[PDB]
Amino acid sequence: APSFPFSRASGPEPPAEFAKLRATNPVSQVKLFDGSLAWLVTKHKDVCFVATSEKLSKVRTRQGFPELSASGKQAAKAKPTFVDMDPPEHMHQRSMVEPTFTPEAVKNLQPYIQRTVDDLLEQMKQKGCANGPVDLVKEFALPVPSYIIYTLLGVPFNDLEYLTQQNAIRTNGSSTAREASAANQELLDYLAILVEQRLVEPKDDIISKLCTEQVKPGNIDKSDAVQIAFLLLVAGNATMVNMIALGVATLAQHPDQLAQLKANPSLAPQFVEELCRYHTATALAIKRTAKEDVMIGDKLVRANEGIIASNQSANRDEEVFENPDEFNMNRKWPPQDPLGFGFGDHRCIAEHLAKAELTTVFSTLYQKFPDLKVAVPLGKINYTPLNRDVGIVDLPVIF
Template sequence: MSESTPPSRPAVVPGELFQDPYAVYGRLREEGPVHQITGTDGLPAWLVTRYEDVRQALSDPRLSLDKRHATPGGYRGMALPPALDANLLNMDPPDHTRIRRMVSKVFTHRHVERLRAPVRRTADTLLDAVADQDEFDLIPSYAAPLPIIVISDLIGVPSSQRPDFRAWTDALVAPDPLRPERAREAVGRLLSFFTQLIADKRAHPADDLLSALISVRDQEDRLSENELMSLAFLILVAGYENTVHMIGNAVAALLDHPDQLSALRADADLLDRAVEELARYDGPAPLAIRRFPVEDIVIGDVTVPAGETVLLSLAAAHRDPRRFTNPDRLDLERDATGHLALGHGIHYCLGAPLARMETAIALTALFDRFPCLSLAVAARDLRRRPSMRSRGLVALPVRTAAAV
């Protein structure tokens, strides 16, 4: 394999990137497999854009998630205190294997299927609340509360604390560049939140995941205190963050493609395939979690030095015509098997079965309830959150009745 110098790019334009990452990353993908870029945070990174390179990199053990392998001064991702930072997104085996094994059985397909009826009841209850409205914002009314309720019930978060948790998570994951102090404040609030939650569960254990993890920590000594809190933080944040955007993006895509929505309504058996295609077409994360080579590594035909930051563009990979025919087209009949929206390799999303099930139920319940649902604004006017980490909508205004 020959090696070459990667094309060098300035910082991508934030507005263009946030609103349409597929155009930006797609242009880079066709120019070359790997690019040296300056991210929107001003820090250097190497961007990988083509499907096969991204897929291989996701499972390459030479690409570490452990920030101790990072070169000083490079992009490391979200800055968190140790009590929240000792999570699976910063770990390699064997610690990653040890901790993932403790919670993996909770997210198996078989266990998740037991949650199907409660999730449908929750979806129906949320839709009851907007049933008499001609127009409403789907994000705060439905797409956001559904996964918050589901994951909070699973882990054991009291209902009174859920709105605050959502606000803090939004401030952390999609920070306001004009108000950076809000992200720092959110970190402090989340740290206090989980400290108190764990103390409450220790004093009053219940039949929930967090109580079980505390038992593992206190009785079996298989987790450090930081690992316990960080694991609870990750499960709750990821269980909300990824799924709210999967649901919101899926609904927006279907309403913008009425022919595909009609096909889905006409054939219920298309639902599982539709969820996969919707995740490929407009998934919740444009980029995978950053990685650091433990040695000089060749990606595509480019050598990336050890310790530098590697960003894997899922947005570019999912629109790569080398892998998907007519990739910019939403096609619910497509076999989207192999998409990377939920990861690949040992870091494959722990909650993938739950995210898929929630998205499928959310779509079914919504379109059963509102068969004439439509966008209340033009698709081009939908605003995206200003985040490189996530692809989500600020709002999704919809109409429930047919246009006159």
């Protein structure tokens, strides 16, 4: 049984192990850091199965849950939020914050999203270019999702820049454990303040909604509200940043498609669709423990055994996506759902918001800067460590 998680084949590539497993051992056992075993599911059909089976659980206090790291096991001790709940608890809490993320609400947020992107682009533009190349991540990829989620949560405008930086420290590779923990606790303390403030004087934001609709009524307590807000913040911000950076790098890697996108920004949604399939920046979230014996393919997963369903592998499943390793924004999509945002009940609550942010970025970026170019050789891009989800740390660009 090989050690898992695997390491990416290279900067922009997924672990090489998946393709081989999909072809000769679709459901196999892998070894976790603590020596425990878990079943790794690699085929699309099987990942969908794992994502929806009611015989499987997300509760981390269940023996057999596939924790992939030491900190993961320790974090499982805290009171859980809907991300780690099974029905009916899951939807009971998730539904408390769903409203802001529906396709309709996101559609209505479009002008705000566009406005946020335009402003950041305009700033990045005045950030000059005569003084050398600028870092697209620090100047654009990072603040776009950060400002949007912070603003949606209820953070005032003047606090955005500082909080964006602090939340970034939480996951920065350069950050020490101490710095990361401090930023983490700092954000939690700040949200606790906002919750106290919004309880007294609610505004038009998620935190306020939690306070008035759930805290005051006594459905949840203040700390719960804080944890739900924190979850919405940290769950996908880092991923958003990486996806934006990865999209820019990918376009540079395929001049033909960049030319096509420049000539037709209306192709942004298709490009984002292909981007979320090709670069599965969140590939270790579909994990479960078997509540009872379950058969998957030619394997029997016994009660209390853990399962890791790789949506990254599923998105490269040759049986579903033709020429899966080819990035093609003009790709002819099959009826099967790409799994960049998961599947089933737990499917990313912000899938629509995330795609809207990406679509806005890629339909505006090259209209603002038609000659935007990565300022270093593509093969020199600074990707995240290979033992981590795919992403880019920094990306110098000129325009």
